[PDB]
Design a protein around this ligand. Structure first.
Ligand SMILES: CC(=O)N[C@@H]1[C@@H](O)[C@@H](O)[C@@H](CO)O[C@@H]1O
Length: 137
């Protein structure tokens, strides 16, 4: 009930937008946003699996992972060259998954006013309001 290891493109099903790194900056504190499909190196994510059943995402080329400093109901998702975060990617529908970090689900946060917004954690409600599709590249 989890995605296998490998390189994928993650797409949000609620708005048909792809997970992207803002500006391709290889610096700490770079927001992970949702943006239109371009297929560049900042939109391809390598999924690596661990022993306990958790998986991590790394950007291709830039080599910036997905790092959440404080796992709280309202924290953002950023990119760090060294530090990482162990995610849980479970299956709710055939084809559509859901990603959580420390028990809190993710959120879409579609861009408003021509500016992307960082993916933010969701409060403990248990209802997956955002599902992701892992298209093989
Ligand atoms: C090629 C490239 O880096 N594209 C990025 C895009 O991914 C997105 O981050 C945008 C932010 O508004 O800034 C650039 O256009």
């Amino acid at each position: 009930m989890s995605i296998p290891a490998g390189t994928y493109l993650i797409r949000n099903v609620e708005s048909n937008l792809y997970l992207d790194l803002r500006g391709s900056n290889p610096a700490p504190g770079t927001d992970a946003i949702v943006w239109g499909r371009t297929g560049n190196n900042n939109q391809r994510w390598i999924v690596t699996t661990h022993s306990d059943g958790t998986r991590t995402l790394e950007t291709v080329g830039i080599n910036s992972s997905a790092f959440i400093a404080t796992i709280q109901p309202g924290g953002r998702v950023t990119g760090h060259p060294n530090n990482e975060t162990r995610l849980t990617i479970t299956n709710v529908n055939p084809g559509e998954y859901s990603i959580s970090a420390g028990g809190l689900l993710w959120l879409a946060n579609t861009p408003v006013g021509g500016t992307g917004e960082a993916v933010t954690l969701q409060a403990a409600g248990g209802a997956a309001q955002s599902l992701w599709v892992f298209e093989a590249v």
